[PDB]
Amino acid sequence: VLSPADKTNVKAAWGKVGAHAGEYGAEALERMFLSFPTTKTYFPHFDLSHGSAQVKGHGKKVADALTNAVAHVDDMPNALSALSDLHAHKLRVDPVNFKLLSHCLLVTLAAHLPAEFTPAVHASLDKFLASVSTVLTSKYR
Amino acid sequence: VLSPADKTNVKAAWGKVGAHAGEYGAEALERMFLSFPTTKTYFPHFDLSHGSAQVKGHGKKVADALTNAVAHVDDMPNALSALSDLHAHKLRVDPVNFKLLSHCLLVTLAAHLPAEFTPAVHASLDKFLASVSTVLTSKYR
Amino acid sequence: VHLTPEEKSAVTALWGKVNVDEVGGEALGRLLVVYPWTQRFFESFGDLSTPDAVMGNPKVKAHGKKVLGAFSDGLAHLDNLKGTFATLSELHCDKLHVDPENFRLLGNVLVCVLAHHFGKEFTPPVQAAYQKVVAGVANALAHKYH
Amino acid sequence: VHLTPEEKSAVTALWGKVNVDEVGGEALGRLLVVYPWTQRFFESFGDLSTPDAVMGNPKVKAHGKKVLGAFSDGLAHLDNLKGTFATLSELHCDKLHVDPENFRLLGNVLVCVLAHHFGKEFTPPVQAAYQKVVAGVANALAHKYH
Ligand code: HEM
Ligand code: HEM
Numbered sequence: 346v347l348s349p350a351d352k353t354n355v356k357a358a359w360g361k362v363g364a365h366a367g368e369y370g371a372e373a374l375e376r377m378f379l380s381f382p383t384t385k386t387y388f389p390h391f392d393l394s395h396g397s398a399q400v401k402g403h404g405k406k407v408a409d410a411l412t413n414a415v416a417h418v419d420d421m422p423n424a425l426s427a428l429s430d431l432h433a434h435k436l437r438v439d440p441v442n443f444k445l446l447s448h449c450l451l452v453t454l455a456a457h458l459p460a461e462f463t464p465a466v467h468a469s470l471d472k473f474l475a476s477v478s479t480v481l482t483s484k485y486r
Numbered sequence: 487v488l489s490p491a492d493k494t495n496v497k498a499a500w501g502k503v504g505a506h507a508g509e510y511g512a513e514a515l516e517r518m519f520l521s522f523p524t525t526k527t528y529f530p531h532f533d534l535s536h537g538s539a540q541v542k543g544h545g546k547k548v549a550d551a552l553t554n555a556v557a558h559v560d561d562m563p564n565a566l567s568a569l570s571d572l573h574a575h576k577l578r579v580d581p582v583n584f585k586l587l588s589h590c591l592l593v594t595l596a597a598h599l600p601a602e603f604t605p606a607v608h609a610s611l612d613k614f615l616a617s618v619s620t621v622l623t624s625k626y627r
Numbered sequence: 628v629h630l631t632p633e634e635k636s637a638v639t640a641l642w643g644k645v646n647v648d649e650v651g652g653e654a655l656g657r658l659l660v661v662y663p664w665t666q667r668f669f670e671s672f673g674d675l676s677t678p679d680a681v682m683g684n685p686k687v688k689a690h691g692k693k694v695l696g697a698f699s700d701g702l703a704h705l706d707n708l709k710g711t712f713a714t715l716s717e718l719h720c721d722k723l724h725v726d727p728e729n730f731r732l733l734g735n736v737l738v739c740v741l742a743h744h745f746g747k748e749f750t751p752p753v754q755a756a757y758q759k760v761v762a763g764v765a766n767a768l769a770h771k772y773h
Numbered sequence: 774v775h776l777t778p779e780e781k782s783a784v785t786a787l788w789g790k791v792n793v794d795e796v797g798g799e800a801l802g803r804l805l806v807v808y809p810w811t812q813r814f815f816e817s818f819g820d821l822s823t824p825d826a827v828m829g830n831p832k833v834k835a836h837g838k839k840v841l842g843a844f845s846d847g848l849a850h851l852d853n854l855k856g857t858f859a860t861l862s863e864l865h866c867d868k869l870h871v872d873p874e875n876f877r878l879l880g881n882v883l884v885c886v887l888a889h890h891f892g893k894e895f896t897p898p899v900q901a902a903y904q905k906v907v908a909g910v911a912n913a914l915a916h917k918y919h
C-alpha cells in the first residue's frame with residue numbers, strides 16, 4: 346500500500362509532469378511497442394509509427410487513467426472498474442505486459458526528469474504503477 | 487475477481503479437502519522447499535526435514551489463513567491485514583515466491599484429487615490463490 | 628541441467644508411463660484455460676471461451692502432442708537443451724515474441740498435469756526433479772530471443 | 774543476440790560514455806530500494822532500510838562496480854553470452870538460487886539508470902537496443918541453474 350510519503354512523491358511527480366502527461370504517455374507507449382514487439386499485437390488496426398497521431402491520442406487516454414488512479418489511491422478498483430473489465434475480461438491483456446508498460450513509463454520519466462527521479466521517487470512510482478497493474482489485471486484474480 | 491462459479495468451485499474444493507487441509511498445506515510447503523531451495527532461506531531456524539513437526543505445524547497455519555481468505559473473498563485485505571504486513575513489510579517475501587507456493591498448493595490438490603481437479607476447478611483455484619498472493623505482497627504496492 | 632541419479636532416474640521412469648497422445652493436449656488446454664491471455668496466440672484454433680471447448684478442441688490436442696514431443700526430446704538430451712531447442716527458440720522468440728514468463732507457466736501446468744495423472748506417485752522429490760527439467764526447457768526456449 | 778547495425782552501434786556509443794565506477798552501484802542500489810526483498814541477498818552489507826543508506830553504502834557501490842563490469846564483458850561478447858556468463862550463472866543459479874525474474878528486474882533498473890543519465894539521448898530505439906542486450910544477459914545468467 347502507498348504510504349503517506351509515497352502519495353506525496355507520486356503527486357509531486359504528477360504535478361511536475363504537468364501538461365506533458367499525454368506526451369509522456371505516448372512516449373511510454375512508443376518505448377513499449379518498440380522494445381517489446383509482443384505488445385503491438387494488442388493494437389492491430391493502429392497506426393504504430395513514430396509520430397502516429399493515434400499513438401499520441403492513446404498516450405493521453407493512458408495518462409488520464411493514471412491521473413484518475415492517482416486521485417483514487419484508496420478507491421482504485423471502483424475508480425477503474427470499466428478499464429479493468431476492458432483489459433482483463435475482453436482483451437485478456439497478458440499481466441506481464443503491464444510490468445513492461447510500467448517500466449517504459451518509468452524510463453520515460455527518468456529520461457525527462459533525471460534530477461527529480463531519485464531512488465525514493467522511483468520506488469514510490471513503481472509501487473503506484475504496480476497498484477494500477479494489480480487492478481487492471483484484477484478481473485483475472 | 488472471483489465469479490460466482492469461481493466461489494462455488496473454491497468452496498467445493500475446500501469442503502472436499504476437509505480435515506486434510508493442514509496436511510495438504512504441509513505437503514505444499516515441502517514441495518516448495520524441495521523444488522525451489524530459495525524459499526528455504528525464509529525459514530532459517532526451522533526443522534525443514536521430511537516429517538518435520540514444525541513444517542506440519544506451519545502447514546496448518548497456512549491452510550487456516552487460506553480458509554480465512556476463502557471466507558472473506560470480498561474483504562480480503564481487511565481479513566489478512568496482519569499477515570500482509572508480516573510477509574510484505576517485515577520478512578519482505580519475494581512476490582515470485584507466492585506464485586511458487588500457489589503452484590505447489592495446486593500440485594498438491596491435483597495429486598490427491600485428480601478426478602475433481604478439472605480445468606475449470608484448476609482455473610478457479612488459481613484465481614483464488616492469486617487474489618491471496620496479491621494481498622500478501624500488497625504492502626509492496 | 629544437473630540431476631542426481633535418483634532424480635534423473637525418477638524422471639525417465641515416470642515419463643515412460645506418460646500417455647504421449649494425451650498429456651500434451653492436456654497441458655496446453657489447461658494453460659489456455661487457466662491463463663486466458665495465452666489464447667491470443669492461437670486464434671486460428673477457434674472458440675476457446677469455455678474449458679470444454681478448449682480441452683476437446685482437435686487442434687489443441689494435436690498441437691499439445693507436438694509440445695509433449697518437444698519435451699521428450701529434451702528428456703533425451705538433458706545435456707544439450709540449447710540444442711534440440713535452438714529451432715523452437717527462434718520460432719517462439721524471434722517470430723512469436725512469447726514472454727519467457729509464459730514458458731514458466733506452461734512448464735508448471737505440465738507439472739500439475741503429471742501430478743494429476745500420477746497421484747501420490749508424484750512425490751515431492753519427483754516433482755523437484757521435473758521442476759529442474761522444466762526450468763531448463765523454458766530457459767533454453769528463451770535463448771536467442773529478446 | 775541479434776542487433777541491427779544501428780542498435781549494435783548505439784549500444785557501443787552510449788556505453789563508451791558510461792561512468793563505470795558509478796552506474797553499477799546505482800543500478801544495484803536502486804534495485805535494493807525498489808524491490809526491497811532483494812536486500813535479503815545482501816545482509817552482510819548492513820542496514821539497507823533507507824534509500825540513502827543504500828545508495829551510499831560502500832559495499833553497494835563496490836559490488837555494483839563488479840556487476841557493471843560483468844555487463845561490459847557481455848557487450849564485448851554479445852555473440853557468446855552463455856560464455857563469459859557460464860561462471861556467474863553457477864554462482865547465481867546453483868549457489869545463490871536467485872529467481873530469473875530478479876535478473877529481469879535488475880536489467881530493467883539498469884535501463885532506467887541509463888535513461889536517467891542520458892536524458893533525451895536515450896531514445897526509444899536506443900532503449901530497444903539495450904532491452905535486447907539486457908534480456909540476453911539475464912537469460913544467459915539463468916542457464917545451468919534451476
Ligand atoms: C498503466 C496501464 C494501463 C493503463 C492506465 C491503460 C489505460 C487505457 C485506456 C485509458 C484505454 C481506453 C479505454 C476505453 O476507451 O474504453 C486503454 C485501451 C487499450 N489498452 Fe490500455 N492501459 C494500460 C495498459 C495496457 C497494456 C499493458 C496493454 C497491452 C500491451 C493495453 C492494451 C490496450 C488496448 C488493446 C486498448 C484498446 C485499444 C483500442 O482498440 O481502442 N493496455 N488503455
Ligand atoms: C498462500 C500464501 C501464504 C499464506 C496463506 C501464508 C500464511 C502464513 C501464516 C498463516 C503464517 C503465520 C503468521 C503468524 O504467526 O503471525 C505465515 C508465516 C510465515 N510465512 Fe507465510 N504464507 C504464505 C506464503 C509465504 C511464502 C511464499 C513465504 C516464503 C517463501 C512465506 C514465508 C513465511 C515466513 C518466513 C513466515 C514466518 C515463519 C516463522 O518464523 O515463524 N509465506 N505464513
Ligand code: HEM
Pocket residue numbers: 665666668669690693694695696697698715718719723725729730733734764765768
Ligand atoms: C514449455 C515450453 C513450450 C514447448 C516445449 C513448446 C513446443 C512447441 C512445438 C514443438 C511447436 C511446433 C513447432 C514447429 O512446428 O516448428 C510449437 C508451436 C507453437 N507454440 Fe509452443 N511450446 C512451448 C510454449 C509456448 C507458449 C507458452 C506459448 C504461448 C502462450 C506458445 C505458442 C506457440 C505457437 C503460436 C506455435 C505455432 C502454432 C501453430 O503451429 O499454428 N508455445 N510449440
Ligand code: HEM
Pocket residue numbers: 811812814815836839840841842843844861864865869871875876879880910911914
Ligand atoms: C543483470 C544480472 C546480474 C549481473 C550482471 C550480476 C553480476 C555479479 C558479479 C559480477 C558478481 C561477483 C561474482 C564473482 O565474484 O564471481 C555478483 C555477485 C553476486 N550477485 Fe549478482 N548479478 C546480477 C544479478 C543479481 C540479482 C538480481 C541478485 C539478487 C537480488 C544478485 C545477487 C548476488 C550476490 C549475493 C552475489 C555475491 C555477493 C558478494 O560478493 O558478497 N545478483 N553478481
